[PDB]
């Protein structure tokens, strides 16, 4: 009985149990309610995946959806990332070739937990590259139950992120391994993984910017080896040509100002390495200063070239969605759709402690340990940690991508303690204290997943006093009516939030979708939703609309209805038509927004108000109230 065989058996067993704990903690929305999809975004992913199942691949690549953005039509194959759809369709095809007849909605529901397992494995490998297996297994056990990654990965939520975190962790593992080994094979594998990441999510910008940043800091620390050259140059070239293949990316790796750090560090690295070669071959006493000065001049010249090409207009500037992360006040003023969404708002410490129980405290200790022992990969880890902390500190939605590094760092820290004291009274008390903290972490994660993030928005649940639960199922009722009691070519008008959900459930032609790529169309819809009946009727006649859908949550206590989202309609419509719609007009002369007799008569004759309050002045509940 060699301890090596039992050690490897224990490692395999603990990875399998981490897989099973990651798969089993994500079923609190399937045990209850039903195995259907939940949020607004996963419906489009589902619909296009269904198309890929029933028409093949070359039909999905050329797919011109005419049942969305009605008068315009949406080119789906060329304005979407085909990474989630292709993976779901491939698993569906493999699973139906073996005569295991599973419907594709079940694959779309249960795709995310399966990939959570692979994410745990990827974290294990990436942490084993930095520290001993112990930290690897501890990090694989940390990111399978952590609530920061469960939130937008629970079974039924079929979005870009479940695949994206796996691909991101695996690309980072492969780049660390390639830099350590120096081989071209690991760089080719890393390039293929980066191509997959490009096809999956719009978070490849983070990968490509982080890799130049790591290489540049390796240059400033005077740690330039030949392996870094053979890694980064091959990675950049192969990954560039691979990234240009996706239709939605296209030629953006050249024109955009997000992919210019990579070309900058590539040029600087070529110059640096040529000058160092010359230095080795020529005498050191003479021409040394000339070599130092030349490196500095090359870097300055690359910076000047980038500035000039950005300024003249050859290189397009940053997008607004990537510029709100720097300006931090540019969203609400100029383009209000960026500030409208609930995800694009900042994060309080409550979320940092609520998504990470003990990790957010032992995480800087692990960062400190990683700084103390410096290697080529640990510089990369430190930069990843700092960048993710900052980016998550300004946007709530992005916190998921921060969760991996935290786990890794925390694992390292905990492993460090279990290295020292484990193996009299003081050491025993230290071991029991750390183990008890881990117990508290596990119990906290289970509580948070049970009570907070396992809640669908399709079916609402109102709980009776005796513990009985009633399900308000009005969304699917109205959408099913709309599906089976209208013409096949009817056009519905709705706010952008539900644009996906109508075309997925109700299967009818919407005018404005959830994905926003033309803001003046949404401005027209907002003006129609916030004028009187005559102007709104003209707007509705010129677009050939038939039905109008409004969500009214006034009979029951539902927070987000269209009256609570009416002011953003007014602001978006004011952004493109300043002469017609005035925000100040819908407020009372005191300066507040109200629905009473004190409300403004410019709102009491609006179309949203006349539309969501029709024949409600006679609807009195049995409980004694007005």
């Amino acid at each position: 009985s060699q301890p090596a065989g039992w050690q490897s058996l224990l490692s395999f067993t603990i990875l399998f149990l981490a897989w099973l704990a990651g798969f089993s903690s994500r079923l609190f929305a399937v045990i209850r309610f039903e195995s259907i999809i939940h949020e607004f975004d996963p419906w489009f992913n589902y619909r296009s995946t269904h198309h890929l199942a029933s028409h093949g691949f070359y039909e999905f690549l050329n797919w011109f959806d005419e049942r969305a953005w009605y008068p315009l039509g949406r080119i789906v194959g060329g304005t979407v990332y085909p990474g989630l759809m292709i993976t779901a369709g491939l698993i569906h095809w493999i699973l139906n070739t073996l005569n295991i007849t599973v419907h594709i909605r079940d694959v779309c529901v249960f795709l995310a937990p399966t990939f959570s397992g692979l994410t745990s494995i990827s974290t294990f490998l990436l942490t084993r590259e930095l520290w001993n297996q112990g930290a690897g297994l501890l990090a694989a056990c940390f990111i399978a139950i952590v609530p920061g990654y469960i939130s937008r990965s629970v079974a039924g939520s079929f979005d870009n992120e479940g695949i994206a975190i796996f691909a991101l962790q695996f690309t980072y593992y492969l780049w660390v391994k390639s830099v350590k080994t120096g081989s071209v094979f690991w760089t080719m594998c890393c390039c293929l993984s980066y191509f997959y990441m490009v096809s999956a999510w719009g978070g490849y910008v983070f990968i490509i910017n982080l890799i130049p940043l790591h290489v540049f800091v390796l240059l400033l620390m005077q740690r330039y080896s030949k392996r870094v050259y053979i890694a980064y140059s091959t990675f950049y070239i192969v990954g560039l040509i691979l990234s240009m293949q996706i239709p939605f990316v296209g030629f953006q790796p050249i024109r955009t100002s997000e992919h210019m750090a990579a070309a900058g560090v590539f040029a600087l690295l070529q110059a640096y390495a040529f000058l160092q070669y010359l230095r080795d071959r020529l005498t050191k006493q003479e021409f040394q200063t000339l070599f130092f000065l030349g490196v500095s001049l090359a870097a300055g010249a690359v910076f000047l070239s980038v500035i000039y090409l950005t300024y003249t207009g050859y290189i397009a500037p940053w997008s607004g969605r990537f510029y709100s992360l720097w300006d931090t006040g540019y969203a609400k003023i100029h383009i209000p759709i960026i500030a409208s969404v609930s995800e694009h708002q900042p994060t309080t410490w409550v979320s940092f402690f609520f998504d990470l129980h003990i990790l957010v405290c032992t995480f800087p200790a692990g960062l400190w340990f990683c700084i103390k022992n410096i290697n080529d990969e640990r510089v990369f880890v430190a930069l990843y940690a700092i960048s993710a902390v900052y980016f998550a500190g300004v946007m709530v939605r992005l916190m998921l991508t921060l969760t991996p590094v935290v786990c890794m760092l925390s694992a390292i820290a905990f492993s460090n303690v279990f290295e020292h004291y484990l193996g009299p009274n003081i050491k025993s008390i230290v071991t029991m204290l750390m183990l008890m903290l881990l117990m508290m972490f596990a119990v906290h994660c289970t509580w948070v997943t049970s009570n907070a993030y396992s809640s669908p928005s399709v079916v609402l649940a109102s709980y009776n006093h005796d513990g009985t639960r009633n399900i308000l199922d009005d969304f699917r009722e109205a959408y099913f009516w709309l599906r089976q009691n209208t013409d096949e070519h009817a056009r519905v008008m709705s706010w952008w939030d539900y644009g996906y959900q109508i075309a997925g459930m109700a299967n009818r032609t919407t005018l404005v979708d959830n994905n926003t790529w033309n803001n003046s169309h949404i401005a027209l819809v907002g003006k129609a939703m916030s004028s009187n009946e005559t102007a709104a009727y003209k707007i509705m006649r010129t677009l050939d609309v038939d039905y109008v859908l409004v969500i009214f949550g006034g009979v029951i206590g539902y927070s987000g209805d269209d009256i609570n989202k009416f002011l953003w309609m007014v602001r978006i419509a004011e952004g493109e038509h300043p002469k017609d719609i005035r925000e100040s007009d819908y407020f009372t002369p005191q300066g507040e927004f109200r629905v009473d007799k004190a409300g403004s008569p410019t709102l009491l004759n609006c179309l949203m108000y006349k539309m969501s309050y029709y024949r409600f002045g006679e609807m009195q509940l049995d409980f004694r109230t007005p």
């Binding site: 949020e39 607004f40 975004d41 939130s151 937008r152 409208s340 969404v341 609930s342 995800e343 708002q345 709530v396 939605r397 928005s457 706010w495 952008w496 939030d497 959830n514 927070s559 987000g560 209805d561 609570n564 989202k565 953003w568």
Partner: peptide, 7 residues
């Protein structure tokens, strides 16, 4: 945390 308008 979804893709809706902040209410």
């Amino acid at each position: 945390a979804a893709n809706a308008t902040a209410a």
